[PDB]
Amino acid sequence: KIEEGKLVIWINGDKGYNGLAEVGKKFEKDTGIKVTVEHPDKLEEKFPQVAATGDGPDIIFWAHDRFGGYAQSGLLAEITPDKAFQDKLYPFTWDAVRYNGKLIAYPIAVEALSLIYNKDLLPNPPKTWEEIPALDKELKAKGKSALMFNLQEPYFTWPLIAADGGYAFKYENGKYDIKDVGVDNAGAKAGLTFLVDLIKNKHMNADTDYSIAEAAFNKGETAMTINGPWAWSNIDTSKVNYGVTVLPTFKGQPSKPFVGVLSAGINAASPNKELAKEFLENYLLTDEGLEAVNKDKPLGAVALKSYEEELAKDPRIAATMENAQKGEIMPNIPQMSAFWYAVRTAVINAASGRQTVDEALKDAQTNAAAEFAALLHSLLEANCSLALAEELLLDGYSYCNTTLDQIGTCWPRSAAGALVERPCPEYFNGVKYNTTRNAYRECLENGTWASKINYSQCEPILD
């Protein structure tokens, strides 16, 4: 139950949330509407958990890639900006928040990873991933190291996995083909093998995470790091003389970072949708709104035309865009969730030595493409058609015809006016259900299936 007459906002702890709370302060002076800014851990996972119950923030901030998954589950309210407001923002940023033709979030800024380097340790940063080994050997002899970045989040190693041909979902004919996953091709193997080898050869440590990497770089202990615009602020404070540049090549191919668009979505269950629309359109997406956040932690290339024209000057923003151009905007489809989790697992497993690169990436392919489910589905499809065959054969006026719903239950041919029961599916979306319970569907008097299927009785099986 979200409070009426206030706004609760969730953003990631790495982003400029104090700047945001400043914009929220201006909103409160003006409207008397208390704006609270929070930054929970694992917010992209908590949101769909709590929002599922009519709970959570009024507004949510994340990269667009999760938002498709949210809109699909019906958690985001449709946004309704006029023509004049849409002209204020770059068209391609709107494209990244469009799901099913509907606009489901406000674009804020374009984020891409860049190479960040210490100009005193390395006045000339390497042009290629392949020089890094030798470069680390030179620096270890000075009690330093070459490169440290977050190895726990697949977002950071992705650029390297994608460099030589690895891809998430194949794009063509204006559509991402969710049956064509590029996580286990030659390119992906090459990219990940290079990373694992850096670790086997002790040029990197498999434990290295965000804070470890950030602290080492800002303490002058490592020559290079890989991070986004939000990290520059802390480097400014640290006084390290740093550059931001193009990512190294791999096998002569540019590193291909997955480009994000930071986006503000409105909770579909929020009673304060007008207030949120006011806040985002008239307060945050203004030069003053954006400047306040950017001065806390840099946003990257902002979505607002009039302010981006100023930031475009900054060679750090220039580097961001060059890396963004060599990479690819993230798909926003619901399957992105499963893709990221599969790649996270692959990288961690391969880096720790739990699995070879080939095993790890195989499992990654199988997970990401929901291949277990495709396989199961086609069995249920086969079976349901058989059930039809037997019926017709034995038979030889007006029934509901055999169908298979999107859960995998095969509803047999039934008489008009019949309430039909089937056992609950044994498996659905990675969860097992108690099959001694029944699902229920009505065959209407007019020989058509009721659109709603009663699945209320299907309980998961749990530990």
Binding site: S73, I407, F428, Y455, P460
Partner: peptide, 16 residues
């Protein structure tokens, strides 16, 4: 994934 995928699944089973 165990308890939360079951949360996600219940929403789906509700709307359908």
């Amino acid at each position: 994934a165990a308890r939360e995928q079951a949360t996600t699944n219940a929403r789906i089973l509700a709307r359908v």
